[PDB]
């Protein structure tokens, strides 16, 4: 069963998403928003400067987009990331620790950009199923059975680890290679409103300062 | 001392070899997540008033005679509802749509009327070219008929190959 | 938080440590502050006072 916010659109309409940057971005992260713009299909990159979060939200519900991807950084290393579904939908502020930008490596080429398959591992919690259904709808519906790039979202040890892979299938085994970013990622708060709202109801919030904080998983 | 939060995961090669060997298992089995498109009589105990001679006559002699009269009552009521409902919604006066056996003459005649009925149908729609009934011939969609005996084997190849890709599609 | 650790290297042996206060709020100590040799930034769960005394349990 899909989430109640995503229920009307779920398979019918393709999403259209916006990757935008915090405020006067460093030239490292302004590259890194383009890897997010490439990791999804139907993603455009609008450079942000002297926009407010109201009139960038309110001029996006108007034009009609599914959601909004905004990034932050520390000294060129990108740190944070939010996805916020627009028609009064939820938001998910992610902290992302271990990044490797694609422009560091080599001029190996350019990505496939075709509709990806996905891989969601180790999501057992009901809050884990929220993060499933809020990440999954950022991709265009119904990928082909033999499309060649697959995007894994793996959850070992409460850090959702996402990698980008291409694959080909040999005479015996599948052989893969990596393109695109390495993330670790961690959600830490989940509002029911958009990222504009700032007083919406908090579905989940990473409590740090609790006697059993380190004990549980998805807590 | 005790730390206050989970340490950020360290990506060893051991982690990735646990990860890319998961992806090969889900690609090769092709069980992976994706956003699929959204597509698009009870017998009556009560005694039958109709006699055995009468029931046979009905068999001897729209969807149902009772159901159509249900449909005809219920559309006469709905057009009464739209009028009163329509009047409140409308900002201008609206006349009642309706006020609810011998030959019946239509007040307004639809279409050209003088023009013949045959003219309205398109030429394409009264003859599509079709595959011939004999096995010994093949007729194409444009009207280029081909027998099976005047073909060459290399033309036999392409036509079976052409009817392969259209049937496969 | 000042004058708990002497050097900026001493803090780095102890980062990630579950610091608590008198008032009963928790936290962690995260990075050794550089420009003075001793101090460090520490994220608590709520706003610490000035009148308040942090204590790190140890054995």
């Amino acid at each position: 069963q899909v989430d109640d916010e995503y229920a009307a659109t779920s398979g019918i309409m393709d999403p259209r998403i916006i990757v935008t940057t915090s405020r006067d971005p460093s030239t490292r992260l302004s590259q890194f928003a383009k890897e997010i713009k490439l990791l999804f299909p139907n993603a455009v990159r609008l450079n942000r400067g002297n926009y407010v979060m109201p009139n960038l939200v309110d001029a996006c519900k108007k034009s009609g987009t599914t959601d909004l991807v905004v990034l932050h950084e520390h000294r060129g290393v990108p740190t944070s990331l939010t996805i916020s579904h627009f028609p009064h939908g939820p938001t998910a502020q992610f902290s992302l620790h271990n990044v490797v930008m694609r422009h560091d490596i080599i001029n190996a080429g350019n990505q496939s950009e075709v509709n990806p398959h996905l891989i969601f591992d180790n999501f057992t919690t009901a809050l884990g199923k929220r993060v499933v259904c809020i990440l999954k709808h950022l991709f265009n519906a119904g990928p082909k059975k033999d499309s060649e790039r697959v995007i894994t979202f793996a959850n070992r040890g409460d850090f959702i680890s996402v990698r980008q892979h291409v694959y080909v299938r040999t005479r015996e085994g599948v052989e893969i290679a990596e393109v695109g970013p390495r993330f670790e990622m961690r959600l830490f708060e989940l509002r029911l409103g958009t990222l504009e709202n700032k007083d919406a109801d908090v579905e989940w919030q990473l409590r740090r300062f609790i006697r059993t904080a380190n004990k549980k998983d998805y807590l | 001392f005790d730390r206050t939060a989970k340490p950020v995961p360290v990506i060893t090669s051991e982690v990735t070899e646990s990860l890319e060997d998961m992806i090969r298992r889900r690609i090769q089995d092709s069980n992976f997540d994706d956003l699929q498109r959204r597509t698009l009589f009870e017998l009556s105990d009560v005694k039958s008033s109709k006699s055995l001679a009468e029931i046979y006559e009905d068999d001897y002699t729209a969807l149902s005679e009772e159901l159509q009269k249900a449909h005809s009552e219920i559309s006469e009521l709905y057009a009464n509802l739209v009028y009163k409902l329509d009047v409140l919604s409308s900002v201008h006066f609206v006349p009642k749509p309706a006020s609810t056996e011998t030959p019946t003459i239509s007040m307004e005649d639809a279409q050209p009327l003088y023009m013949s009925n045959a003219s309205s149908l398109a030429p394409q729609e009264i003859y599509n070219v079709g595959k011939a009934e004999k096995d010994g011939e093949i007729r194409l969609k444009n009207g280029v008929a081909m027998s099976k005996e005047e073909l060459t084997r290399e033309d036999k190849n392409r036509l079976r190959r052409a009817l392969k890709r259209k049937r496969s599609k | 938080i000042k004058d708990m650790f002497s050097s900026a290297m001493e803090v780095a042996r102890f980062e990630g440590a579950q610091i608590k206060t008198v008032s009963g709020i928790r936290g962690e100590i995260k990075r050794a502050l550089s420009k003075p040799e001793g101090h460090y930034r520490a994220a608590f769960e709520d706003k610490i006072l000035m009148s308040d005394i942090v204590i790190l349990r140890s054995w």
Partner: peptide, 27 residues
């Protein structure tokens, strides 16, 4: 390194704790 020890033993001394408790209650 001490974080990965202080966490892992404290998880063992709770994961061994509920087993030793629930073995009391059922008996």
């Amino acid at each position: 390194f001490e974080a990965r020890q202080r966490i892992e033993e404290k998880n063992k001394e709770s994961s061994d704790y509920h087993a030793k408790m629930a073995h009391i209650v059922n008996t």
